[PDB]
């Protein structure tokens, strides 16, 4: 799969993760500069979403969609990951009224990008995370995957909600 941003085409770097694969646990950093494990136990579905930067317009809509869904379905875990430092994640979420969303930074280890295969290769956005959604079942197996072909498009939310019923 190759992701497009205007005239740029991107190779995805890191290990390819497909529907049926056990999703690896990875170390991320939260707004308190606390190291956390991505995976949550005692939850029917885990939704993990990545975006290139919370400073983007399309990116903010994505974060705002998953913030709202956090309150709507408590039996589902929602996580949003970017390469933004936790400081700017906290400030953007604070400015834009995103107070429920589990917002995590991949900056320290790039473990999410490397292990979910959404690291953007050579180009202006190199080292940022491709716009993407993974859903894991109660056993941490990938049951749904979207890496958005055009990074300026939002994820397919209709496809995602069908998986969560």
Curated annotation (Swiss-Prot):
Keywords for this protein: Antioxidant, Disulfide bond, Oxidoreductase, Peroxidase, Redox-active center
Cross-referenced Gene3D superfamilies: Glutaredoxin (3.40.30.10)
Enzyme class (EC, first level): oxidoreductase
UniProt family annotation: Belongs to the peroxiredoxin family. Tpx subfamily.
Disulphide-bonded residues: 59-93
Note: The active site is a conserved redox-active cysteine residue, the peroxidatic cysteine (C(P)), which makes the nucleophilic attack on the peroxide substrate. The peroxide oxidizes the C(P)-SH to cysteine sulfenic acid (C(P)-SOH), which then reacts with another cysteine residue, the resolving cysteine (C(R)), to form a disulfide bridge. The disulfide is subsequently reduced by an appropriate electron donor to complete the catalytic cycle. In this atypical 2-Cys peroxiredoxin, C(R) is present in the same subunit to form an intramolecular disulfide.
GO MF annotation terms: thioredoxin peroxidase activity
This enzyme's EC code(s): 1.11.1.24
Start and end residues of each Thioredoxin domain: 17-165
Pfam families noted in UniProt: Redoxin
Catalytic reactions of this protein: a hydroperoxide + [thioredoxin]-dithiol = an alcohol + [thioredoxin]-disulfide + H2O
Stated name of the protein: Thiol peroxidase
Function: Thiol-specific peroxidase that catalyzes the reduction of hydrogen peroxide and organic hydroperoxides to water and alcohols, respectively. Plays a role in cell protection against oxidative stress by detoxifying peroxides.
Organism name: Helicobacter pylori (strain ATCC 700392 / 26695) (Campylobacter pylori)
Subunit-level organization: Homodimer.
Highest taxon, organism lineage: Bacteria
């Amino acid at each position: 799969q190759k992701v497009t941003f205007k005239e740029e085409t991107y190779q995805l770097e890191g290990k390819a993760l497909k529907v049926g694969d056990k999703a690896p646990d990875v170390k991320l950093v939260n707004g308190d500069l606390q190291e956390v494990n991505l995976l949550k136990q005692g939850v029917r579905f885990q939704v993990v979403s990545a975006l290139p930067s919370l400073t983007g317009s399309v990116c903010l809509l994505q974060a705002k969609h998953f913030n709202e869904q956090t309150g709507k379905l408590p039996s589902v875990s929602f996580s949003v990951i970017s390469m933004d430092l936790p400081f700017s994640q906290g400030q953007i979420c604070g400015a834009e009224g995103i107070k429920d969303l589990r917002i995590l930074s991949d900056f320290r280890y790039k473990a999410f990008g490397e292990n979910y295969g959404v690291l953007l290769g050579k180009g202006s956005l190199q080292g940022l995370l491709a716009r993407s959604v993974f859903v894991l079942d109660d056993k941490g197996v990938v049951i749904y995957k979207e890496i958005v072909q055009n990074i300026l498009e939002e994820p397919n939310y209709e496809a995602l909600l069908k998986v969560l019923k």
